[PDB]
Symmetry: C7
Subunit: 77 residues, 7 copies
Amino acid sequence: MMKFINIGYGNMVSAAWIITIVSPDSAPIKRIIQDAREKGKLVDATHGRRTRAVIITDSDHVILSSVQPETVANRLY
Amino acid sequence: MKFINIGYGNMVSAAWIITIVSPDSAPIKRIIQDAREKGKLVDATHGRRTRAVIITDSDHVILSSVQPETVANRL
Amino acid sequence: KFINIGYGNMVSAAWIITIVSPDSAPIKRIIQDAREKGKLVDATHGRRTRAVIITDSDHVILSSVQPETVANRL
Amino acid sequence: MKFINIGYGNMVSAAWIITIVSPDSAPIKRIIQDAREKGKLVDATHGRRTRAVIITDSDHVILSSVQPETVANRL
Amino acid sequence: MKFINIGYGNMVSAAWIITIVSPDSAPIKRIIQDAREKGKLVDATHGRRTRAVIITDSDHVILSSVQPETVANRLY
Amino acid sequence: KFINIGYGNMVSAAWIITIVSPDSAPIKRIIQDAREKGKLVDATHGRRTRAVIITDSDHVILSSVQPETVANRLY
Amino acid sequence: MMKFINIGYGNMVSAAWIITIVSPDSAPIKRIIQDAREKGKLVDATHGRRTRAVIITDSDHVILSSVQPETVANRLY
C-alpha cells in the first residue's frame, strides 16, 4: 500500500482523499466535470489521451485520469 | 477493504461513507433529486436499476446497482 | 465500522456525533431544519422514529431502533 | 470508550467533542442561546440541573446534568 | 491524554486544538474581542487571570488560567 | 509527515490531495485562481515550477521539484 | 514524536493541523499574511521579533513565528 498513486504521466493523487473513481459513461458525470471546469476545480491529467477514470476528492476537485478505475484502486496495492 | 467495488468497476472509498440506504422510499428520491441540483449526484448503476444509495461526507449522493448488504460486506 | 440501523440501512460509526431520543430534544426542529437544508435521511421505513443520528456534515438520520442498542452494535 | 451516555440514553461520540465546560459563564450562555436559536442544541438535562456543556464539531451544543470531570471519566 | 484539564474541570480535546498562545500581545486580544462578539468565545478561567488562549479547529477561542507550555505538558 | 519542497519550505503530506505537472494546461487557471484569490504559495524561490501541490484548504503551492520527488520524499 | 510544537516564546502549534511552513521571502505570502491580518485569522507569535516562518493551518489560520522553518519542522520529535 502506497499513500500516493500514479494516475498517469507522473501526476499523483493521495488515496486518503479520494471519494470515488467512476467511468465517464454517464450524463450526470459529464455535468460533474463541467461543474468542476466552471469552478476551476478540474484537474486534467490525461496529458492528451482519452479520459478513462474520473476521480472525485473531498475538496470537491475532479481529477481526470487516463487509466482504468479498477487500475487506479489497484495501484493502491 | 479501503476501496469498494459498487458495480461495473466504479469504486468508492469506505473511509468517506456516511450511510447506505434503500431507494424504496419517497424521502430518499427527494434526496436524489436534491443531489442533481447541487451537482452532487454520481450515477454508477451503469443504466441498471438503483438498489443502494451511498451518501458521502462531501455531500455526494452515489447510486449503486448493488444491494446495501452487498456493499456493506464488500468492505 | 458499519452499523445496521434497521431494514438494511447502514451508518458508519466514525461519523456519528450524537444519537438522541425523540423525547429528549426539540427534535421536530432539528429534523425540519435537516429537510430544509436537504440533509434528512429517513431509514424508519414507515415505523416510528426512536433514534435520531446526527453525523458530521450535518446529516440527520431517522432510525426505528432504540438509541443505546445502536451504540451496543459497535 | 468511543460513545458516551450523557443522560437518558443520549449518546455522544468522544472523537467529535471539542470541549466540556462548566456553566455559569456569560459567553457560553450565548453559545447555548445561539445554538438553541440555530437548531443545533441537544438538551439532555431533564430540568434538575445543568452541570456540563458539551460543544462538538459543527457547533452542536449538548447540555448534561453531571459534572465535566464525570463526563470525561466515562472514557 | 485525549482530553486535557485546562483549569477547574474544564476539558479540551487535544485533537481539536490548533494553537495555544500567550494573551500578552495586541493581535491576540483582537482575536478574543472578535470571538466575544460572534459568540465563539469560551471563558474557562472561572474568573482567574487569563494566561493562555486556545484556538480550536471550529474557530472557538478558549481562555484558560494556565500557562501555554503547561497546557502542552498535560498532554503526556 | 513534513516534506521539504525546496529552499526550506515544508508541506505536511497529510493535506496534499494531488501533485500535478505544470504541463497540464487547465492548472494554469488553477494557479491564477489561487494567485488572484490570495491562496497561492510560491516556493519556487525564483526557480522554475516543476510541481503544483494542491491541498485540502484549497491552497496551491508551487514547488521547484518533480511531482515524483514530492511524493517520494514522504519516506 | 510529539503533537505540540513550540514555535517560540511559549507559543505552541499542533502539528496535525499544519498545512505548510514557508519563508517570509515570497511576496505572495505577504498578501497571505496581510489578508489574514485585516481578516482576523492572524496569530502573531513573534513576540516583537522578525518573522522567520509562516505557519498555515487548516481553518485558514496564519501563524507567524520567529524561528526558522526547518526549526519548526524538526522540533516535531
